[PDB]
Design a protein around this ligand. Structure first.
Ligand code: MTA
Ligand code: MTA
Ligand code: MTA
Lengths: 273, 273, 273
């Protein structure tokens, strides 16, 4: 791919709020334009070094939270990270909780998801003539999931070690009836809007992708229903802990994901017809 | 917004079949073109007075039922009503029933919904750069719901005082397997095709929106499955009762929705980032 | 419709893999271009005779499996078959199983479906001004279903005589959490990606459409999750049996579907407003 400036490469992608990026840590940061066949990524990708590991930061909503979940150019974002050479992708996300023990301020490292989106326009990179059906039974990268859990537990933070993420379309939040389906019918644990098709595309790109979720709310279930103000406030209250985990995990990603704990790392070997 | 004729305003919107509009009641009716950034509303909006309350009538399918649910320009419709100044929106809708006691000819004033649509292309007005996530835990306007229930009970009509509306994509009707999911898995009460994204957009526009549903059929559950002919016949058989309720409720809407019984009336106060 | 070569007609459509077409059987085969208002069908339609019945073969993925499920021009495919004059449509499909007794290599003739797609862009031919809502309580053509079951049982093959097909969006395969919803919550039997909106459009076109499914895998439920390689291998291992059933059934379709066992054959009589 063409990049400007030319020649830029990276090894770990970080997708999340622009507040995760700390200019006090990242060595030799550069804003990079990475061409894609899908147009612009959400914002500049900031590439720089953390403990000698080259990181590409990409705020999925753009700086300033300009781009709501349904409007994100997921294809461009994942294509650009892959084009840079990344092997690992850490997503950081705000989620609602469907269970009392997943409390606001707790981290969750989900292991499963249920896609209830509808309007994301492209759920794949492969529209033909090579038909590709990736296996996503185990859709996250187990290597990276375990690294995230370990980091949180070493830092003394609550990090729930599993969870099913229901991805809804939004931007409006769930009705009570919908939330009861998510909680009591689907038996899901957390809820968000951005996982899908991000994760699909990451898998197809043979990336080791995992989500570090932060519970920001209990959806409809507490005294007052979730609001955007609530989500943003709680996220910003907890962003420093998310940064501590990121900067703890990244230095340990200098190597490669373990193939036998990376469901997608050879996804295309058996997926393409 | 530009209107033709210029200067037109209204206080209550009525969305439903064009047969709800009664030229024998509405004073000084005018067909109005309201510019929108989304193109044409379903039809002309007819503005006129009912007991001194200014009403804007908008047939969501167009006159003659020209526009099926998936083809409606929901954004244009709601933008136009908001641009006219409306505070209240009464939707009148035909629905199927998933429960024996919600009989054809009965009114239902739903309180919840489950969105099973997929192809409506825009589920919001807010695509950036201001990200908006409205709370829709309680998606209808309680003030108006209670007014509709009261009117029906004063007229002597059956009006079920709650219900979960499952909105399906259509235009084809549900399979038996789908209907069993709606009824037995989701525990929904009624089924229709037009609620979503109408309601989402109304909430984002800070309107007090409520649905007066008329049960027209039992979906798959009676001896013969629902047909369009059946829906239309039963609706037209009952339209006069729907008109009686409309013309009973509207005169009492000269004032404002009660903020504490209007979940969406200040939706943007905590929804925008 | 214009066709090239001109004047081509057919009585039975066959939709499935191009490997179903046997040049050793089909008399006087011709590749036909059938104009549609939706652009190109997936590939040429090959028209020829089987035991004096005129068949139109249409590989939904194209020759070479060029077109994944979400990219198929369903409208063009069904319009073209209808334009040729077909009355019957046999779909042949690979499916996953959600139940141990529906084993790889077994045929299934589903009777129901649950549409979990989202990105197919058009779910109907009718976008106005004639609004059409077809009844699909019983979405397959019972006449043809029973013919397929009979053929399999006469050939000595396992053919499950009912089933609920959950149609997912793809192209990625289901997560374990999703598969548990399909199996344990929706109580579905098989899973695929191509049924919808094919079946909707066939019903609207007043065709007698039925699916001959071949189980190729157990989705997430066996020791290793489904892969595309697995599906393709098992399908190609079993294609000859599918051909035997096709060439056994087709000669018996010289006449018309029985109206009282064809839910869609007069669909438009009560569907159009
Ligand atoms: C900042 S408010 C919007 C964000 O909240 C996240 N999220 C947090 N809580 C919830 C919830 N209860 N339901 C859905 N998404 C949620 C979503 O992924 C979205 O981008
Ligand atoms: C006039 S026939 C079509 C209309 O029927 C309404 N409706 C009535 N009964 C049902 C039903 N059983 N399922 C879905 N929509 C229904 C829908 O919102 C649609 O616009
Ligand atoms: C050839 S691999 C892709 C095909 O597998 C079919 N299919 C087979 N098994 C499954 C499964 N487990 N889930 C979904 N689709 C499946 C789909 O309809 C698709 O076109």
């Amino acid at each position: 791919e063409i990049t400007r400036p030319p020649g830029v490469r990276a090894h770990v992608g970080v997708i999340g709020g622009s507040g995760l990026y700390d200019p006090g840590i990242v060595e030799n940061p550069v804003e990079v334009k990475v061409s894609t066949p899908y147009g612009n990524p959400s914002d500049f990708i900031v590439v720089g070094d953390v403990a000698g590991v080259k990181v590409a930061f990409l705020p999925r909503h753009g700086r300033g939270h300009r781009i709501p979940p349904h409007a994100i150019n997921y294809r461009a974002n994942i294509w650009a990270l892959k084009a840079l050479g990344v092997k690992w992708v850490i997503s950081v996300s705000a989620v609602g909780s469907l269970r009392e023990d997943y409390r606001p301020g707790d981290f969750v490292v989900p292991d499963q998801f249920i896609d209830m989106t509808k309007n994301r326009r492209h759920y794949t990179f492969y529209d033909g003539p090579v038909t590709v059906h990736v296996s996503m039974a185990d859709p996250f990268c187990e290597d990276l999931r375990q690294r995230l859990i370990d980091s949180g537990r070493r830092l003394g933070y609550t990090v729930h070690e599993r969870g099913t993420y229901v991805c809804i379309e939004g931007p409006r939040f769930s009705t009570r009836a919908e939330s009861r389906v998510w909680k009591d019918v689907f038996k899901a644990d957390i809820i968000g809007m951005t996982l899908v098709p991000e994760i699909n595309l990451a898998c197809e790109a043979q990336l080791c992708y995992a989500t570090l979720a932060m519970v920001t709310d209990y959806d409809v279930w507490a005294d007052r229903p979730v609001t955007a103000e609530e989500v943003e406030r709680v996220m910003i209250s907890n962003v420093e802990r998310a940064r501590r985990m990121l900067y703890d995990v990244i230095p340990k990603l200098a190597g490669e994901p373990e193939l036998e704990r990376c469901s997608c790392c050879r996804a295309l070997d058996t997926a393409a017809i």
